Every structure is written in C-alpha cells, then in structure tokens.
Amino acid sequence: LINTSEVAKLKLLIMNFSFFVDSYIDLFGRTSKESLGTPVPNNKMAEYKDEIIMILSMALTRSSKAEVTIRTLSVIQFTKMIKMKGFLTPEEVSLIIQYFTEEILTDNNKNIYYACLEGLKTISEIYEDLVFEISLKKLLDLLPDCFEEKIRVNDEENIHIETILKIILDFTTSRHILVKESITFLATKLNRVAKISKSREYCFLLI
C-alpha cells in the first residue's frame, strides 16, 4: 500500500485492497440506510483509511484517460469501500460521486462509463440525498435552455443533449427522492423548452 500511478503497481495494490475490504466486511459488517455514518469501534484500516482513499482517488482521477482496468477497479473499490457501514463520511461519498460523474461525462470509454454508472447506482441505492445533490442536480444543470446544443462538460469534452436523458434513465429507477425530483425537473424543462424554446424531439424525449 504505497502511492503509485503505474498500471502494474497500482493494479496489484487495488486487487490486494479488494481482499482487505472483504476481510474488513466479514469482520465488522456492511452498510444499512440507518448505519450510513456509524463506524465500527476499532481497527487498523481506520489508520490506513486516508491512504486507501487517496490511492483510490488518484487511481480513478488525476489519471490518464486510457486506463480501463485501473479506473474500473478504482470505481469498484470505491463502491466496495462505500459498502461499509458508516466508515466513510458523506464528504468522502460526495467526492466519489463527483469523481464518477466527471469521469463518466469526460470519457466515452464504455468500460469506465458503465463502471461509473454502476458506482453511481450503488451510491443511489445506499445514499439518496448524496447522489441526488451532487450528480443528479449537476447533470440536470448541464443541459441548456435550447435544444440541439453541445453539452460542454469542460473546455474540450462534451456530451450529447440526449446523454443527460440517458443518464437519468440509467439510475433513479428505484430511488424515491431521486425519481420524484427528476420527474419534477424534467417536467420543468419540458415546459421551458416548449415555451422559451421551439423543440419537438427534446420534448418527446423528456416526456
């Protein structure tokens, strides 16, 4: 467990951590929606929690876009570490949600794309308000006033106008707060793109 961005060293570190998360789980427990913040009394992984968080963060983000196995294992270990009962603060899962959303809008690589989708969906089923606040609201904000625009995620990488709709279709399938607020906001945007804009396919896709 030493900081490393090399594909081999970081990959072996992550696949090792994949067994220590399982040992920690078997020894202590897993998340419940009531135990989202409750930590276990004592362990040595808490002393190493900052190091594993940092190595996972640099394994997914602040990393090259060509990493398919590295980023897939990164989001997988992020999700597995989230799966522990209240051992990561809402700040940590917020950072993880932001990482997933940024790396899923930036890269089209369906490996990292669908792995980030899986991570975001698991966060949604284990953290309603967190995902709805960071990922869902941002994604609803990327879409503009007028239809048929380039959804500029950043200076260069952009997604389609229907990409937001597809992402909305992906999760919120079982998240009450997410799905209700999403229905409300999609109705709001339907009204807006019909009133201040003149579009048909966007209204059709939204409805």
């Binding site: 090259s64 060509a66 990488e157």
Partner: protein, 203 residues
C-alpha cells in the same frame, strides 16, 4: 481519418460484376482470398491502434474501420483474429448503422460458440449492452432487436447457469416493446426469448 474509417468498407465488398462467374473466364484477375487477406492485414494494426488511442474521434475511427471490414468478411472464416477482436467486438455494439450491428452480433455469436473464457469474463459487461440493443431506439431496428434476442439466447446458452441466473429479470423486463412492436416475427421471437429466459431461470 474519420472519413477514411467510414469509407473503409469499400475495400471489402461483393462485386456482382467482377468475379470468376460461371461461363466467363476472362472476367478479371479474380482472387477470392482478398477478403480474408485484407482482414489479416487490417485487423491487427487497427486493434493495436485502438488500444493505443484516447479520444472520441480516433477510437471511433478504429472501431468503425474494423467493423466495416469485419462486416463483409465472414466472421467464422476469421478465427485467430477473434481474441484480439473481442474488445472492439464489444465496442461495436452501439453505433447507428444496423449493418455493423448485425455484423458484430454475428461475431459475438461465433465467438461465444468458440470462446468461453472471454464470454464468462465479459458477460457482466455484455448483458446490459445487449439489453440496450434490444430496447427500441432510433438506431435499433426491429431486425436489430431480433438479433439482440438471438445473441441473448446464445450467450445465455453458452454462459453457465451461475451468471445466467443473475441476468434473467432484466431481460424479462426490458423486452416489452419487442414482443409488441410493429413486426410480429420480432414479437414471436421476443415471446420465445422471454419464455426461454424464464424457464432457464426457474430451473
């Protein structure tokens, strides 16, 4: 390179006017081995370049080129290239042209008939992609959805029951516009796909 990739299908196609037709013998300098040879000359470099590429454009070019080459060459005649093709094979399952769709669906059929380690290690990735293929879309024709049904059946047959039990409800749920679409062979085969998935999961 994008234009070259989208035009790169031309190298491998049928002619219907210049082959060694019965009767004529002075037709051309006909060589039937052009398809396979061209694949063996193209595929490898393409895949190496795709695994050595980052962005929207150039990777999309590599996928489109390799797909437009594999679409005209018979998939069962190109066997050694299948293993390195499996990544771009899985990549080619989401793009507008139903031609590359039918080609890549056929190629996964042949792969899962031959390869099983790739299928077992990549089922958790392929299954929702085939689900999106089976969903109605501006790019999913009724034939495309039918072929997604056929590949779903083939991969469920090849993959052991362990993973197939985990992927029964999604296929049963995300197929309702397929057994009720405009055509009915699509509907009949979606009914059959749903029934076979249900009987495989229940047993």
């Amino acid at each position: 390179g994008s234009l070259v990739s989208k035009l790169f299908e031309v190298f491998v196609m049928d002619i219907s006017s210049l082959k060694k037709f019965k009767g004529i013998s002075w037709n051309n300098n006909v060589k039937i081995l052009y398809k396979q040879k061209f694949f063996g000359d193209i595929f490898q470099t393409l895949v190496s370049n795709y695994k050595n590429t980052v962005d929207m454009t150039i990777k999309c070019n590599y996928l489109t080129a390799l797909s437009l080459v594999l679409k005209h060459t018979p998939s069962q005649s190109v066997g050694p290239f299948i293993n390195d093709l499996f990544p771009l094979l899985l990549q080619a399952l989401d793009m507008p042209d139903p031609e590359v769709r039918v080609s890549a669906l056929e190629t996964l059929k042949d792969t899962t008939d031959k390869h099983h380690t790739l299928i077992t290690e990549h089922v958790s990735t392929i299954v929702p992609l085939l689900l999106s293929l089976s969903l109605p879309h501006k790019y999913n024709s009724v034939s495309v959805r039918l072929i997604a049904l056929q590949l779903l059946e083939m991969i469920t047959t090849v993959v052991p029951l362990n993973y197939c039990l985990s992927y029964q409800d999604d296929v049963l749920s995300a197929l309702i516009p397929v057994l009720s679409d405009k055509k009915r062979i699509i509907r009949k085969q979606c009914v059959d796909t749903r029934q076979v998935y249900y009987e495989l999961g229940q047993i």
